[PDB]
UniProtKB/Swiss-Prot annotation, chain A:
Domain NR LBD: 6-237
Region ranges (Interaction with AKAP13): 1-237
Organism: Homo sapiens (Human)
Protein name: Estrogen receptor
Tissue: Widely expressed. Not expressed in the pituitary gland.
Subunit structure, as described in the record: Binds DNA as a homodimer. Can form a heterodimer with ESR2. Interacts with FOXC2, MAP1S, SLC30A9, UBE1C and NCOA3 coactivator. Interacts with PELP1, the interaction is enhanced by 17-beta-estradiol, the interaction increases ESR1 transcriptional activity. Interacts with EP300; the interaction is estrogen-dependent and enhanced by CITED1. Interacts with CITED1; the interaction is estrogen-dependent. Interacts with NCOA5 and NCOA6 coactivators. Interacts with NCOA7; the interaction is a ligand-inducible. Interacts with PHB2, and UBE1C. Interacts with AKAP13. Interacts with CUEDC2.
Part of the whole protein covered: 306 to 546 of 595
């Protein structure tokens, strides 16, 4: 059904699929230690993951994939999705990261965990870049769906496999069409439309980078990462 | 900036003419390190000819190269291996396949090579993509505000260059932006491959081959 959506139907589907805003655990002891703060973020992240599978099942075209390739895309994308959501929540709070409405952290609180100030600096800079470009909500939900479909597609010798990759790349093309259509409705010229598209997609490489760093530093300290069976369990419900 | 007055055809001509030669190979990590060592010297001199790159302070040029150096090598590899399905053409005399492989990276590099082949990636588009990698990889990690604004204009020029090439080649508008999106989403997998390779380099204890900031400033 996904490839039959017009642009505006794609936007509506994605908007209505949006996950809820969750709160951090209430009145934790502050200030934080390294362990306690990581406990809070791990607890929030784990609760956001249930809602991210609900959201992914509603991304047009996702369900058409085999459960195996659904899990694979979520394994590859889950941190990038958590991170772009964090950056979007944080746009209107310059200098700060809004992990939850009750958990707004300034730069110097990232120092609690050993090398998580560097990722904080990267998330803040991305939020400024979104604020500069005046990223629109309809653009964000498109970008977040691109992350889900694109991040894992390149590491899927059966003929079945080529069919899903083509189906991926067809949905991605449709979300590209959708992004362009929103820009044209906004009133951007063709040249501005092309430049803004590239410039939203180029930011995705940095979000990949941040995600890879996040994992990397995490390890240099592991089991907290969600397992295949866990993602696959949650999917089957 | 004369970079910002360039037409699409001047931009391609500048990048095509700055293309480094394909070098030859002459322990498998030793061979690759020797090759990469020689590849680097050409990449600095190539980066200096990317339009709008020398208008950056030497501090910012180094930061971009430090961020982008392994993505640039990797995309070169993928481009050389594109007509050798199943194999990676590290050099005309060092063509390897999966068995010789670091199997994780190899399969990611091969999948990237197959994607470029599936899309019929053109050499004019190739050079455009490497320039983007160089200018985009470290711009978010950065006087500072004039610098970033300059880099985003040059990036807009390369976008215009890519779109112009497609328009010539006969693609419709819808095919043009779809084309542009597919090329740019591949860059995000190249960044991922660079990160994997980078942590792997350190995992195998060879964290000395990563050119440092000072080394790049010196070569520059
Ligand atoms: N340190 S990090 O940058 O590697 C990592 C990303 C961010 O900070 C950390 C964190 C997180 C993730 C999973 C965990 O189990 C624990 C902590 C974060 C996080 C980001 C968005 C969000 O919605 C919830 C949490
Ligand atoms: C035996 O163990 C291994 C562990 C890893 C690998 N890797 C990829 C495996 C092949 C699929 S890799 O990602 O670490 C790294 C990127 C690419 O392959 C390596 C390499 C390089 C870079 C600088 C060095 O000083 C030395 C090696 C690469 C490279 C060099 C030149 C070039 O033009 C293009 C790419 C290989 C062997």
């Amino acid at each position: 059904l996904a490839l039959s959506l017009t642009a505006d139907q794609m936007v509506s589907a994605l908007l209505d699929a949006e996950p809820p805003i969750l709160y951090s655990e209430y009145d934790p002891t502050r200030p934080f230690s390294e362990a306690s703060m990581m406990g809070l973020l791990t607890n929030l992240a784990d609760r956001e993951l249930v809602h991210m599978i609900n959201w992914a099942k509603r991304v047009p075209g996702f369900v058409d994939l085999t459960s195996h390739d659904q899990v694979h895309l979520l394994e590859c994308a889950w941190l990038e999705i958590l991170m772009i959501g964090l950056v979007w929540r944080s746009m209107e709070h310059p200098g700060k990261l809004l992990f939850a409405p009750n958990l707004l952290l300034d730069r110097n609180q990232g120092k609690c965990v050993e090398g998580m100030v560097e990722i904080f600096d990267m998330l803040l800079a991305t939020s400024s870049r979104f604020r500069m470009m005046n990223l629109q909500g309809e653009e964000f939900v498109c970008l977040k769906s691109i992350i889900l479909l694109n991040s894992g597609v390149y590491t899927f010798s059966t003929l079945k496999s080529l069919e899903e990759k083509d189906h991926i790349h067809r949905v991605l093309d449709k979300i590209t069409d959708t992004l362009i259509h929103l820009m044209a409705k906004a009133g951007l010229t063709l040249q501005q439309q092309h430049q803004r598209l590239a410039q939203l997609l180029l930011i995705l490489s940095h979000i990949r980078h941040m995600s890879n760093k996040g994992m990397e530093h995490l390890y240099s300290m592991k089991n907290v990462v969600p397992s295949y069976d866990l993602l696959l369990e949650m999917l089957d419900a």
